[PDB]
Structures are given as C-alpha cells and as structure tokens.
C-alpha cells in the first residue's frame, strides 16, 4: 500500500536503474517516402492520442494517465521487425521505419508530451514532466542506434555474432530486471497492475494495430506495406519507456508506475502472436 523507506535511493534501487540503461543499449543496437512518412503519422498521431483518450475514458488518476501517455509517446520497438516478417510484411522496410521513428522521437516525444500534458494537469502542471531528463535520455539512446547501423556496414561479418550476443544478453537481463524491480518495490506492484491499468495495457496495442491498418488502407497502400505499417504502429519501445520513467522521473512521483511498460510488452507480444496466427490460418484456409 505504501512505498519502501528511502525508495529510489538504496543501492538496490540504483543498480536497477543501471541494468535498465545497460539493457536499452543493446535493444537499440540490435535494430541495425509515402509508405515511410505514413508510419510516422500513424505512430505519433494515433498512439499518443489513443493513450490520452483511454486514460480519460477509464477515469485513470493523473499520474497513471501521465505514465500511460508517456508509454504512448515512445517510438516503435524492435518487435515489429520480427512481426512484419512473420506476417508476410517487409522486414527490410520495417527496420527503416523503426529507425526513422526512433530518430524523430528525439524531437517529437517532448513536443507531444508538452501538448498532451495540458489535458491531464490544469494548474499544477509545472515540473510535472522532466523535459531535460527525457531529452538527455532520448539523445543518449541515439548513440547505440547509430553505432548499430555503422557497425553492420563497416564490419558485416562480426554482426552475426554481435546480434546473437545481444539477443542472449537481453533475455537474461529481462529476468534480472523483472525480479530485481519487483523485490525493490515489494507489494506496491498491485498499484501498477490494477484492473484499469491492465485494461489500458491490453486495449492500447489492439487499438494501435487496428488503426494503423485502417489508416494505411485509407491511404491506398499495398497489402505488404499496410500489414507492416499496422504492426509498426502497434508495437512500441517498452524498454525505452521504462528506462525513461525509472530514470528521468523522480521515484516519489512515479513510484511503481515504471512497471507498466512490461505489462504493455507482454500484451503487445501476445496480441501480435494472436494476430499472426489469425492471419496465417486465414491465408491457409482461404
């Protein structure tokens, strides 16, 4: 019900904020105009708006809605790269979509947060959002993303081993973070997985998946570009959102609300798997 004494300052609290950053470095390292400029419109015009509408509809608290919108403002993740390949989309084009969305995040995420924060806080809006801490993280995470691109081009041979090394490092670190943060916060987790938070964590990826497809069909796209744009919109950077919420924000204001990105990651992965199965069964039995 409460938070542990000296929350966000113990060595066990400072280590967890370091493993998250050491995680995100490889997550954003393993990732390396109508169809491409449409994904940006569907990602920064539909996902942040959905995150702001859902919080108002579900009557979420101010801090929970701010965390929801922060999660809906982060760029697309690397899961869409595999999802588009699994749904006969375009892996090569979905990779440049995600890289371009990540690069546009540095200038669009603070701008969208500033615009949509006025819909949550009316008079007590000052110092609610740490813009300096958000932009520092956003400009620091652009370094692994760029070295990932220049590494594959300069030394393609080693990249096959580096990608496997990163994929095996992130898998164990994910458990090491899910366990460490849970031990750190104690019994305050039941605040980040309330029924309303779980419903917002499940209805958001589905809404993104559907609305990206609908918009891409509205813009008269091909069946491959449409199917990769939808899942590039639906999938987001849960690790980068969690790292931002755990680092830039003060621990006393957010508390256990940085655990929502993982509950969003599991729901987006489950719904992507279900959509892939549905599509493949539809194609096989057509």
């Amino acid at each position: 019900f409460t938070l542990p004494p000296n929350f966000g300052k113990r060595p066990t609290d400072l280590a967890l904020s370091v493993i998250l950053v050491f995680m995100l470095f490889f997550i954003m390292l393993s990732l390396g105009p109508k169809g491409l400029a449409i994904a940006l419109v569907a990602q920064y015009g539909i996902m942040p708006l959905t995150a702001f509408v859902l919080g108002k509809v579900f009557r979420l608290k101010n801090i929970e809605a701010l965390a929801i919108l922060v999660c809906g403002c982060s760029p697309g993740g690397n899961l869409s790269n595999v999802f588009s390949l699994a749904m006969k989309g375009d892996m090569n084009l979905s990779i440049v979509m995600t890289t371009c969305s990540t690069f546009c995040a540095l200038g669009m995420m603070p701008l969208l947060l500033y615009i949509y924060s006025r819909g949550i806080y009316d008079g007590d809006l000052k110092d609610k959002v740490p813009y300096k801490g958000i932009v520092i993280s956003l400009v620091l995470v652009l370094i692994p993303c760029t070295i990932g691109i220049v590494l594959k081009s300069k030394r393609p041979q080693y990249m096959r081993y580096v990608i496997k090394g990163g994929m095996i490092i992130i898998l164990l670190c994910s458990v090491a973070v899910t366990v460490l943060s849970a031990i750190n916060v104690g019994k305050s987790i039941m605040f980040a997985m309330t029924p309303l938070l779980i419903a917002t964590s499940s209805l958001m990826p589905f809404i993104g998946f559907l609305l990206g497809y609908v918009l891409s069909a509205l813009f008269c796209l091909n069946g491959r570009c449409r199917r990769t744009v939808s899942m590039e919109t639906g999938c987001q950077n849960v690790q980068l959102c969690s790292t931002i919420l755990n680092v830039a924000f003060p621990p006393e204001v957010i508390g256990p609300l940085f655990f929502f990105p993982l509950l969003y990651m599991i729901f987006q992965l489950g719904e992507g798997l279900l959509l892939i199965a549905i599509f493949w069964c539809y194609e096989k039995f057509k």
């Epitope: 409460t2 938070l3 004494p5 000296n6 929350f7 608290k61 009316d122 006393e252 256990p256």
Partner: nanobody, 127 residues
Framework: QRQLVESGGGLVQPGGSLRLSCAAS????????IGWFRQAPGKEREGVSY????????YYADSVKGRFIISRDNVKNTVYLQMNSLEPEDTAVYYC????????????????????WGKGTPVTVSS
C-alpha cells in the same frame, strides 16, 4: 509563488489566535503533502505543520504542538493552519509547500523535495 497563495497573516496580540490559508491556484490537494513553514529574521526556515492528505498523517513541531492545528477544506481547495495561544517568539513569515506525492509519504517520512512554494504571509505577534 503562482501555484500557492497564502493569506490570513496579520498583527495579533500575545494570547490571541489567527488562521492562515494555502489556496491552490487551480488544482486539488489530493495527491499532495501540504506543509506550513516559517522563517524569522536571524533564523532559517523551519517546518511547523505537515499533512499527508492521503491518509491523514500529521507532523507537529515541538514548539507548536498543542497550539497549531492544520486542516484541509476539500470543497474549497485550501489548507488552513489554526494558530492558537500565540507568543512573542512566534512572529515570522509563514510559507506553505505542496509536494506531488500520488503514493503518499515514502514509508513514514515527510519529504518536500521539488515542492511548490508560496511567497509567504508575515505574522507579527506583539503587544
């Protein structure tokens, strides 16, 4: 400054009482821990009364315990501080802080880091 406005300060005689206010600019004191401070010429700012406003936890300084009572008005977005039995050494400028704590106090302690601060209202207690 612009988020919190203090009022009620005035000149009172030793033995009288007065009540201050901490009306919020435009918001509610729900996810906040209000706290009244005071700073007299020669000494530094010290707390006199806090409030959790989520569970009712109250802190009272040992120099105002039994005399000062802090309260809240949910229907007016104000926080009061009833100051009874004022003494000559009680004259100072009384400020009011408000720290955004949606989850309450961190365990049991009253924190005020990154809190909105008012401009303060002077209180002169003399004959």
């Amino acid at each position: 400054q612009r988020q919190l406005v203090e009022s009620g300060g005035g000149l009172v005689q030793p033995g009288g009482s007065l009540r201050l206010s901490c009306a919020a600019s435009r918001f509610t004191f729900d996810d906040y821990t209000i706290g009244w401070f005071r700073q007299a010429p020669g000494k530094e700012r010290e707390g006199v009364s806090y409030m959790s406003s989520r569970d009712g936890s109250t802190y009272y300084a040992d120099s105002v315990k039994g005399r000062f009572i802090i309260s809240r008005d949910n229907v007016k977005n104000t926080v009061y501080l009833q100051m009874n039995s004022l003494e000559p050494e009680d004259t100072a400028v009384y400020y009011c802080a408000a720290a955004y704590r949606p989850w309450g106090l961190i365990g049991g302690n009253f924190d005020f880091s990154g809190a909105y601060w008012g401009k303060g209202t002077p209180v002169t207690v003399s004959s």
